[PDB]
Design a protein around this ligand. Sequence first.
Ligand SMILES: [K+]
Ligand SMILES: [K+]
Ligand SMILES: [K+]
Ligand SMILES: [K+]
Ligand SMILES: [K+]
Ligand SMILES: [K+]
Ligand SMILES: [K+]
Ligand SMILES: [K+]
Ligand SMILES: [K+]
Ligand SMILES: [K+]
Ligand SMILES: [K+]
Ligand SMILES: [K+]
Ligand SMILES: [K+]
Ligand SMILES: [K+]
Ligand SMILES: [K+]
Ligand SMILES: [Mg+2]
Ligand SMILES: [Mg+2]
Ligand SMILES: [Mg+2]
Ligand SMILES: [Mg+2]
Ligand SMILES: [Mg+2]
Ligand SMILES: [Mg+2]
Ligand SMILES: [Mg+2]
Ligand SMILES: [Mg+2]
Ligand SMILES: [Mg+2]
Ligand SMILES: [Mg+2]
Ligand SMILES: [Mg+2]
Ligand SMILES: [Mg+2]
Ligand SMILES: [Mg+2]
Ligand SMILES: [Mg+2]
Ligand SMILES: [Mg+2]
Ligand SMILES: [Mg+2]
Ligand SMILES: [Mg+2]
Ligand SMILES: [Mg+2]
Ligand SMILES: [Mg+2]
Ligand SMILES: [Mg+2]
Ligand SMILES: [Mg+2]
Ligand SMILES: [Mg+2]
Ligand SMILES: [Mg+2]
Ligand SMILES: [Mg+2]
Ligand SMILES: [Mg+2]
Ligand SMILES: [Mg+2]
Ligand SMILES: [Mg+2]
Ligand SMILES: [Mg+2]
Ligand SMILES: [Mg+2]
Ligand SMILES: [Mg+2]
Ligand SMILES: [Mg+2]
Ligand SMILES: [Mg+2]
Ligand SMILES: [Mg+2]
Ligand SMILES: [Mg+2]
Ligand SMILES: [Mg+2]
Ligand SMILES: [Mg+2]
Ligand SMILES: [Mg+2]
Ligand SMILES: [Mg+2]
Ligand SMILES: [Mg+2]
Ligand SMILES: [Mg+2]
Ligand SMILES: [Mg+2]
Ligand SMILES: [Mg+2]
Ligand SMILES: [Mg+2]
Ligand SMILES: [Mg+2]
Lengths: 386, 131, 62
Amino acid sequence: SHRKFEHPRHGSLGFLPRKRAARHRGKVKAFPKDDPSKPCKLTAFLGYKAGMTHIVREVEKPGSKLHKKETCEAVTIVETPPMVIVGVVGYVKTPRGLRCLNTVWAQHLSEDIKRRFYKNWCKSKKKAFLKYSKKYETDEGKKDIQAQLEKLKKYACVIRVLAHTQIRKMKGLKQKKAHLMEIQVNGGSIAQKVDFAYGFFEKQVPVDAVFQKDEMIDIIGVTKGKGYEGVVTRWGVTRLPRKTHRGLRKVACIGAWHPARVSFTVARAGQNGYHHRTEMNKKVYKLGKVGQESHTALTEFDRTEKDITPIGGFPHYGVVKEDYLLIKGCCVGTKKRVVTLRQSLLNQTSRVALEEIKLKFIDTSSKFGHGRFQTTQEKQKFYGRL
Amino acid sequence: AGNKFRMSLGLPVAATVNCADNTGAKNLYIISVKGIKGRLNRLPSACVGDMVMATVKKGKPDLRKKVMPAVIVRQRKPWRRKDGVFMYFEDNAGVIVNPKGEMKGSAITGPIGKECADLWPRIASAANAIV
Amino acid sequence: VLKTELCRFSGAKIYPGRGIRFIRSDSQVFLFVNSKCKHYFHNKLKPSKLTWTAMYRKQHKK
RNA sequence: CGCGACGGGGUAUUGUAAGUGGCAGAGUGGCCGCCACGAUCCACUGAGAUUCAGCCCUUUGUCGCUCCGAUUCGU
RNA sequence: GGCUUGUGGCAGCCAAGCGUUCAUAGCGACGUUGCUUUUUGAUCCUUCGAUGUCGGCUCUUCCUAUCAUUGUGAAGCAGAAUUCACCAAGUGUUGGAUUGUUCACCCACCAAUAGGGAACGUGAGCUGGGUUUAGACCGUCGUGAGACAGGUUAGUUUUACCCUACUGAUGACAGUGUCGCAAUAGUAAUUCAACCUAGUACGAGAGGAACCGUUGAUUCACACAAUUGGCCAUCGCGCUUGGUUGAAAAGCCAGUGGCGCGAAGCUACCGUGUGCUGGAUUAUGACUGAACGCCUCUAAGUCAGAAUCCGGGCUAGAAGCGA
RNA sequence: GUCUCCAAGGUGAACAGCCUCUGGUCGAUGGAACAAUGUAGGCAAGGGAAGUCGGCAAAAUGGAUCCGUAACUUCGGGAAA
Ligand SMILES: [K+]
Ligand SMILES: [K+]
Ligand SMILES: [K+]
Ligand SMILES: [K+]
Ligand SMILES: [K+]
Ligand SMILES: [K+]
Ligand SMILES: [K+]
Ligand SMILES: [K+]
Ligand SMILES: [K+]
Ligand SMILES: [K+]
Ligand SMILES: [K+]
Ligand SMILES: [K+]
Ligand SMILES: [K+]
Ligand SMILES: [K+]
Ligand SMILES: [K+]
Ligand SMILES: [Mg+2]
Ligand SMILES: [Mg+2]
Ligand SMILES: [Mg+2]
Ligand SMILES: [Mg+2]
Ligand SMILES: [Mg+2]
Ligand SMILES: [Mg+2]
Ligand SMILES: [Mg+2]
Ligand SMILES: [Mg+2]
Ligand SMILES: [Mg+2]
Ligand SMILES: [Mg+2]
Ligand SMILES: [Mg+2]
Ligand SMILES: [Mg+2]
Ligand SMILES: [Mg+2]
Ligand SMILES: [Mg+2]
Ligand SMILES: [Mg+2]
Ligand SMILES: [Mg+2]
Ligand SMILES: [Mg+2]
Ligand SMILES: [Mg+2]
Ligand SMILES: [Mg+2]
Ligand SMILES: [Mg+2]
Ligand SMILES: [Mg+2]
Ligand SMILES: [Mg+2]
Ligand SMILES: [Mg+2]
Ligand SMILES: [Mg+2]
Ligand SMILES: [Mg+2]
Ligand SMILES: [Mg+2]
Ligand SMILES: [Mg+2]
Ligand SMILES: [Mg+2]
Ligand SMILES: [Mg+2]
Ligand SMILES: [Mg+2]
Ligand SMILES: [Mg+2]
Ligand SMILES: [Mg+2]
Ligand SMILES: [Mg+2]
Ligand SMILES: [Mg+2]
Ligand SMILES: [Mg+2]
Ligand SMILES: [Mg+2]
Ligand SMILES: [Mg+2]
Ligand SMILES: [Mg+2]
Ligand SMILES: [Mg+2]
Ligand SMILES: [Mg+2]
Ligand SMILES: [Mg+2]
Ligand SMILES: [Mg+2]
Ligand SMILES: [Mg+2]
Ligand SMILES: [Mg+2]
């Protein structure tokens, strides 16, 4: 018989299976559509989640209750030191999808990236790319390298650069093995893309070259892990009455008599968290460039001299010293987790997307408690230098 | 202009709040909340500025055993202002109105939330302090 | 210059984006810097009696 | 070659440690102001204690370890 | 459960008449043709070396005979509201009083509070109020023992570790590692309100809209913890009862002695952020245009076109594959 | 499940509970982790029975001293109202 009363089902069937992701680094499932008329430009960037804080800004939203008023909104700090281009890869459009044609690497590869090719770097002989690097040392070898590049210019339809992070510059991560990914190049002709990619071999690409302030971006990563979990927490099914024999944190009926099988739409206990997710429309409130006033937490209204890092350091992360992005809202994953930043696939035309951000105050009090001092000097002056 | 942002709901059905006007009622018993579409098993709940249907459980006999609309003016459940500050009153209070939001009484005792004042100009007119 | 409030109980400076505001039945407004001050206030503890509060230090000429 | 064990600093929680002194202290008992008892109070003292165990920085400083091995894998 | 469909429910044909006029906007008397198995009967084919027998709760999926939402045709459609019909099951369909109820009835909210299936879905999922053992009371019946599709009150709800299904977890997938492609499967967003349009169109008046646009909200989904809130055996600090170590100091015991605060971690519409775009089409309205010298959206050939469909995006990634 | 004798100190009304002395004893197979579900014990913002057949369960009350104590009543009670 029909169910007595109607309510929507618990959970989404579009995020199945709820298994552990087969990767730790966020994978870009789709890159922005390529517009040849635009200059060559990267479409993605890697970063590390440092922590969260809140900011205050004066809203400019005509017709809104908040117009010319102040609002406090949470932000996430993503430390984004420049990436290093170490190779280029070209794909050919075939009836069976894109097929990788060839991969060309730079002559010199850092130790941090070479660690990515080993399970035990210290115990190994460190032979990776040693023979490959030698053909850059001979005229005949150089001709072969150039020939491979010309082959990409002739047949490749999609060009992606091999870029890795400088993870050594963030000592808080306690990791020396850098993260490598393919970043697609959009704009210009195929020849320009290859020339654009080859020109950056062994060079650094700052985050500012990919993203900017006030634009919407997509954040990709793996959510926080939580292990084996029951249906109530995993799927959000309501608890059973107090007097239920054999427990109340369950789904009462997991299926009708027919079909004589448990369906895949029924909530079941299992892995919760550590799932791959792609979240859209995260606005960039601030881009901090090292060596510039933008790197500090100063604002046109608050002239207190202070850094982005709260006193005592970002919990479980450390001190942010490299380029960083201030992103509205929350970011997937734990502290220190590598996150993938991607340009929006949609055309940003809403007023929120085009809104010009103007921060008034950035909170730098300690996040390891009920912090009430924005700077260490303020705290010391409070206690008579303590 | 703009519409009011969402607030924490602290007054579900069966909640009994003080009557903040001088109509003779001493408390208001909430039986439903206007604008609620609802969910299975979810009790309708109201916040400051919401219009609710209530009955007077204690007051003048003329106001008892009857269903009348009312507006919540104070609540004890903290709610977040856009400026990041959480506010709450010392008690829960409301005022009896008509379906058009006009006060049945003529005076209000104690302060009222700013959210309710913006939505109901008639209530704000009779208010003493708007916080 | 930023506009900062003061905690009514402890006297601590409250920076924008946080704080707890309590409206007493007599329309008095009380700003608390954290739940510690809120709980002590609602427990009827006098700031003058708590050593760490600014009211105590001012009265004791600390 | 950094790591690890101490320690220091940063950060945070509690709310002012123990000891010493007091012409603070409701009073009371002896002696010829002195002595004794006294919860509590004041000064040293936003003091002391705790703070990664899944917090941050780190030799000013101290100390240790840097690899005995084992199991497999071939176009 | 099966056959049957009298009965129950739903639908069509004829046109006497109703509808101020006017058979057919909307209705359909007298007759007559069907569908349905969400009613109840009829039967006794399966089960009596047992298929756990009411309802509710919980949870998923399915149907359309569509209550609301999207696009349209019709009207005795001025507007507003309402009614009839078409494509349509994508999304939603609630909080309560009384009753064991199914059913019903009322209060209230809402865009709407449509109807059903899945062994009258669902008891090794619960619950046990009812029914349906043994105790007991009443009424009626019986000489009596006792009887009552009459009322009443108390009355043990057992087992999974097997196979499969389902959920996740390793492994296998021909050296090892890195970066990738990708068949295929899953899939998600949703509805409302305010302001403006506008007291405008329309109308004698009363009354009284809509698209665009702007700002919010509901249901849902996926994350997240700067802030607020919650949780303490940080047994972190303080306070404190009884006992105890000759006192002080400092501790311990009372399975967490108790109390206040309590960072961290975890966590809540009790907190915060985010939630998407092309193509082909349905109904329907049209273009050109014959058959049929005219006419005709149709026959050949075309256009617009939706909460539709497919793709894209999002989740997974094959004894699939590349560099 | 099975009759009975002896019975310390403190707190307190008390062979109540809690702690201790004499005497007895650490006998219950151990180790490492800290998932779901469970059993036992807790706590919780705002609301306060809306849950459910039904306030089931839990919470709240609780000792002593002083004041004060209604209807009704068989005059005794009710009453620790
Ligand atoms: K059912
Ligand atoms: K959640
Ligand atoms: K529940
Ligand atoms: K409703
Ligand atoms: K001391
Ligand atoms: K002190
Ligand atoms: K029939
Ligand atoms: K049988
Ligand atoms: K079962
Ligand atoms: K009994
Ligand atoms: K290989
Ligand atoms: K798809
Ligand atoms: K917390
Ligand atoms: K457990
Ligand atoms: K109840
Ligand atoms: Mg349904
Ligand atoms: Mg894809
Ligand atoms: Mg974990
Ligand atoms: Mg039971
Ligand atoms: Mg914190
Ligand atoms: Mg319910
Ligand atoms: Mg230290
Ligand atoms: Mg560590
Ligand atoms: Mg019939
Ligand atoms: Mg007929
Ligand atoms: Mg049998
Ligand atoms: Mg059986
Ligand atoms: Mg069975
Ligand atoms: Mg149909
Ligand atoms: Mg008309
Ligand atoms: Mg449907
Ligand atoms: Mg049937
Ligand atoms: Mg059944
Ligand atoms: Mg069963
Ligand atoms: Mg059973
Ligand atoms: Mg049953
Ligand atoms: Mg029973
Ligand atoms: Mg019986
Ligand atoms: Mg007889
Ligand atoms: Mg009974
Ligand atoms: Mg598909
Ligand atoms: Mg006119
Ligand atoms: Mg002592
Ligand atoms: Mg002992
Ligand atoms: Mg106890
Ligand atoms: Mg939320
Ligand atoms: Mg024509
Ligand atoms: Mg057509
Ligand atoms: Mg077309
Ligand atoms: Mg005694
Ligand atoms: Mg005793
Ligand atoms: Mg509570
Ligand atoms: Mg409370
Ligand atoms: Mg109450
Ligand atoms: Mg009830
Ligand atoms: Mg109910
Ligand atoms: Mg009932
Ligand atoms: Mg009970
Ligand atoms: Mg009585």
